[PDB]
Design an enzyme around this catalytic site. Structure first.
Site, mmCIF file in Angstrom:
data_model
loop_
_atom_site.group_PDB
_atom_site.id
_atom_site.type_symbol
_atom_site.label_atom_id
_atom_site.label_comp_id
_atom_site.label_asym_id
_atom_site.label_seq_id
_atom_site.Cartn_x
_atom_site.Cartn_y
_atom_site.Cartn_z
ATOM 1 N N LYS A 1 -6.381 21.938 -3.636
ATOM 2 C CA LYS A 1 -5.509 22.298 -4.772
ATOM 3 C C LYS A 1 -6.213 22.192 -6.165
ATOM 4 C CE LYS A 1 -2.898 18.983 -3.098
ATOM 5 N NZ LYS A 1 -1.719 18.130 -3.007
ATOM 6 N N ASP B 1 1.653 12.899 1.272
ATOM 7 C CA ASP B 1 3.011 13.258 0.768
ATOM 8 C C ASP B 1 3.916 13.880 1.843
ATOM 9 O OD1 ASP B 1 2.163 16.298 -0.992
ATOM 10 O OD2 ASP B 1 1.349 15.315 0.871
HETATM 11 O O1 LIG Z 1 0.682 18.410 -1.361
HETATM 12 C C1 LIG Z 1 0.730 19.223 -0.167
HETATM 13 C C2 LIG Z 1 -0.599 19.255 0.550
HETATM 14 O O2 LIG Z 1 -1.529 19.950 -0.268
HETATM 15 C C3 LIG Z 1 -2.848 20.089 0.283
HETATM 16 O O3 LIG Z 1 -2.761 20.888 1.391
HETATM 17 C C4 LIG Z 1 -3.416 18.759 0.825
HETATM 18 O O4 LIG Z 1 -4.695 19.048 1.397
HETATM 19 C C5 LIG Z 1 -2.480 17.960 1.692
HETATM 20 O O5 LIG Z 1 -3.022 16.610 2.022
HETATM 21 C C6 LIG Z 1 -1.100 17.877 1.005
HETATM 22 O O6 LIG Z 1 -0.107 17.399 1.930
#
Ligand SMILES: OC[C@H]1O[C@H](O)[C@H](O)[C@@H](O)[C@@H]1O
Ligand SMILES: Cc1csc(NC(=O)c2nc(Sc3nncn3C)ccc2Sc2ccc(F)cc2)n1
Ligand code: NA
Length: 448
Positions: free
Chosen positions: A156, A192
């Site tokens: 991200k 998360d």
């Molecule tokens: O925030 C949502 C997701 O974003 C990205 O995919 C991360 O790599 C993951 O660990 C997280 O759960």
């Protein structure tokens, strides 16, 4: 129709969804087995959160949430409810992370975090006090335990140097002691997805899956320990962080990928990585529409083939515009204002076409995502022997929650893919902070 022909490239037929679904399921099986876990695009990361926990400490916990554009610090009270623990968030504060804090080093960045943690405790007359800390860390981690794991890579768009490959809980306990100020017990680092899932557990014990569709996209679910080959043991269940965002990184989605996807991917912080997430996540959704729009202006189909300077800049079509475009009631005033703000002067038909371009992108996101979760749920169907598998999914994230039709579209399609499952969706209330605490609470009964 010249427009509608460009847009119809975004369509997926049911058999396409079923194919994505079966491939997701295959990838998931691969990440779980020892012989393939290492090359596996879908990492299926054991999280060490386990079933039938029973034995929780009560009282007050500090929750950190890092993975958003903005870092958060909050205080959560866990206490004793019927067949489980209640929780409630009592104090919160959100902190921006400056251009310089990010593009720096991990130890730098983790100071900024400890700083904010002090800042927060000062303001609440708690800097003296020592509490168990719940850390929600929304990035892929290889865990050794509940309180120890290495970051694999940032996702991200994050990019702090010298953080990848190191123990995150390590990196934080360090920097909390280049402070002296305060001391927390760091009892549990969670994803998360895992936190949202746990935050719904008290109200519904059938919640065995956590999904995020926000900036990023991912899910976790309760897996049978005999299938979790990377953790010794066969008794019980452990949550697995699928990290399904990276589905497609081995070329599993190559037939579906469009030009706009190869562009978003090629100019991202992580070229070649997080391909599936790039079809769905709000970090990329507006950018996809942008590129679709620029394609349309180039064929002279939109804005009389003339694009603004804002429209030609990356990041300028914000995902929130997609969602606001699709809330337009039919008068075109929301569309007009968004496009006008972007330095454009749309006609009636330019507006309608921007709408359709948004719908095309967000409907393909809904459907793509639906096949992922149908993969997870039908995989779990194999290990359940009721007539109807009743399962609850905890979900969070602004794409899923706030895009006007995303969740409806998502729901219908997942249902179509998951015969003999009766799926209940719960939107998480303070998923990240309240789920990190609830798990901290349980891991306390051992490390305290
Ligand atoms: O925030 C949502 C997701 O974003 C990205 O995919 C991360 O790599 C993951 O660990 C997280 O759960
Ligand atoms: C080793 C270790 C460290 S913490 C841990 N497990 C948890 O904290 C935990 N795990 C699950 S697993 C599950 N089983 N069926 C479905 N789900 C999700 C469920 C809940 C919790 S905490 C909790 C407990 C009760 C409550 F009312 C609210 C939260 N294991
Ligand atoms: Na195992």
């Amino acid at each position: 129709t010249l427009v509608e022909q460009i847009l119809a490239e975004f369509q997926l037929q049911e058999e396409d969804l079923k194919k994505v679904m079966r491939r997701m399921q295959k990838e998931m099986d691969r990440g779980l087995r020892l012989e393939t876990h290492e090359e596996a695009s879908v990492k299926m990361l054991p999280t060490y959160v386990r079933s039938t926990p029973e034995g929780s400490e009560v009282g007050d916990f500090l929750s950190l949430d890092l993975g958003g554009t903005n870092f958060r610090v909050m205080l959560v009270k866990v206490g004793e409810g019927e067949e489980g623990q209640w929780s409630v968030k009592t104090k919160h504060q959100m902190y921006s992370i400056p251009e310089d804090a990010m593009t720096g080093t991990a130890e730098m960045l983790f100071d900024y975090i400890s700083e904010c943690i002090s800042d927060f405790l000062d303001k609440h007359q708690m800097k003296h006090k020592k509490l168990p800390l719940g850390f929600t860390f929304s990035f892929p981690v290889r865990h050794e335990d509940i309180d120890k794991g290495i970051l694999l890579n940032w996702t991200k768009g994050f990019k702090a140097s010298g953080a990848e490959g190191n123990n995150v809980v390590g990196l934080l306990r360090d920097a909390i002691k280049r402070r002296g100020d305060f001391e927390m017990d760091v009892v549990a680092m969670v994803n998360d997805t895992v936190a949202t899932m746990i935050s719904c557990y008290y109200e519904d014990h059938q919640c065995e899956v956590g999904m995020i569709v926000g900036t990023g996209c991912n899910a976790c679910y309760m897996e049978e320990m005999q299938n979790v080959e990377l953790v010794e043991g066969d008794e019980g269940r452990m949550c697995v962080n699928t990290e399904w965002g990276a589905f497609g990184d081995s070329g599993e989605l190559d037939e579906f990928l469009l030009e706009y996807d190869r562009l978003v991917d090629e100019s991202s912080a992580n070229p070649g990585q997080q391909l599936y997430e790039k079809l769905i996540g709000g970090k990329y959704m507006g950018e996809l529409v942008r590129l679709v729009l620029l394609r349309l202006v180039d064929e002279n189909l939109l804005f009389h083939g003339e694009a603004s300077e804002q429209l030609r800049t990356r990041g300028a079509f914000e995902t929130r515009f997609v969602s606001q475009v699709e809330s337009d009631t039919g008068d075109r005033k929301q569309i007009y204002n968004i496009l006008s703000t972007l330095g454009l002067r749309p006609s009636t038909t330019d507006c309608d076409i921007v709408r359709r371009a948004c719908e095309s992108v967000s409907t393909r996101a809904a459907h793509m995502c639906s096949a992922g979760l149908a993969g997870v749920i039908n995989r779990m169907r194999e290990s359940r022997s009721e007539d109807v598998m009743r399962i609850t999914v905890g979900v969070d994230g602004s794409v899923y929650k706030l895009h006007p039709s995303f969740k409806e579209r998502f729901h219908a399609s997942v249902r179509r893919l998951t015969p003999s499952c009766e799926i209940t969706f719960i939107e998480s209330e303070e998923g990240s902070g309240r789920g990190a605490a609830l798990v901290s609470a349980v891991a306390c009964k051992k490390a305290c």
